Design a protein around this ligand. Structure first.
Ligand code: CL
Ligand code: CL
Ligand code: CL
Ligand code: CL
Ligand code: ZN
Ligand code: ZN
Lengths: 158, 157
């Protein structure tokens, strides 16, 4: 399946973050309130793996980082409207990622695309912190941001 | 120093290993598990994708997140069953499903059963189109990895 880049990959805190988009997909079960394959303009995927700093949190470097809460914000240049898109964790043929089928509500054009990545919720994940088996790192409190100021929505490339 | 609960099992698309060692301090402290000081040990369920595995879109050896893992402990000679809710967490050696555990029935031989449920309906999805798309589907009833002769003789540390 052809993947198209959103922009340059980012390294933010303990995460390596990439963004791609491609034709809308059919997901099972259909996640949250996302548009159907027919209603969507495309599928946007956030590829999140631990980088070297991720090692202090106990992640294997280069591995997928689960239990995160990822939200994308889309804002067309010259517009005050901002779309807020909740990403969901899911598997495609090339493994897990956070993604969503999305509509570019203000049409064709240039958009600021921002991914805000929050650490797992308090009751959803833990870290060993004892000396013997523990980690020296901790999760981030303020959400990490990977953003692209000039993404071009030029319509389906399929 | 890690000790096995028994031999690793392959159940459906999962490679499941069970180990135990000294109790640990976790942050946040998960559900109702005993503290490092209160506990007998820490038990870990290591769950990674096997060849079957690939059908769901995982890479062989990848940790499989979003599962709901519970362990049932039953001492040989007793009718009592103790239930242990595992929680997802990272240790210095990576992500695992684990729990600090106090053996309510004490020293002895136990049947140890891990029940592994697929992600909740609203917590994970699969791309199912021909194009992007995976052919396997998550299991309905929990997968089981069981050891019937686990010997708990007290701390080995
Ligand atoms: Cl924005
Ligand atoms: Cl929270
Ligand atoms: Cl900012
Ligand atoms: Cl049992
Ligand atoms: Zn996706
Ligand atoms: Zn653990």
């Amino acid at each position: 399946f052809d993947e198209f880049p959103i922009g340059e990959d980012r390294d933010v805190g303990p995460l390596h973050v990439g963004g791609v988009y491609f034709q809308p997909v059919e997901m099972h079960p259909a996640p949250g309130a996302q548009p159907s394959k027919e209603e969507a303009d495309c599928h946007i995927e956030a590829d999140i793996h631990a980088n070297e700093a991720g090692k202090d949190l106990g992640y294997g470097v280069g591995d997928f980082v689960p239990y995160l809460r990822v939200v994308a914000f889309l804002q067309k240049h010259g517009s005050e409207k901002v779309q807020k898109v909740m990403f969901a964790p899911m598997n495609a043929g090339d493994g897990p990622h956070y993604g969503a089928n999305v509509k570019f509500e203000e049409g064709l054009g240039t958009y600021k695309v921002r991914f805000e990545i929050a650490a797992p919720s308090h009751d959803e994940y833990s870290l060993h912190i004892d000396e013997q088996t523990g980690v020296s790192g901790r999760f981030w409190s303020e959400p990490l941001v990977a953003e692209w100021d000039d993404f071009e929505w030029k319509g389906p490339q399929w």
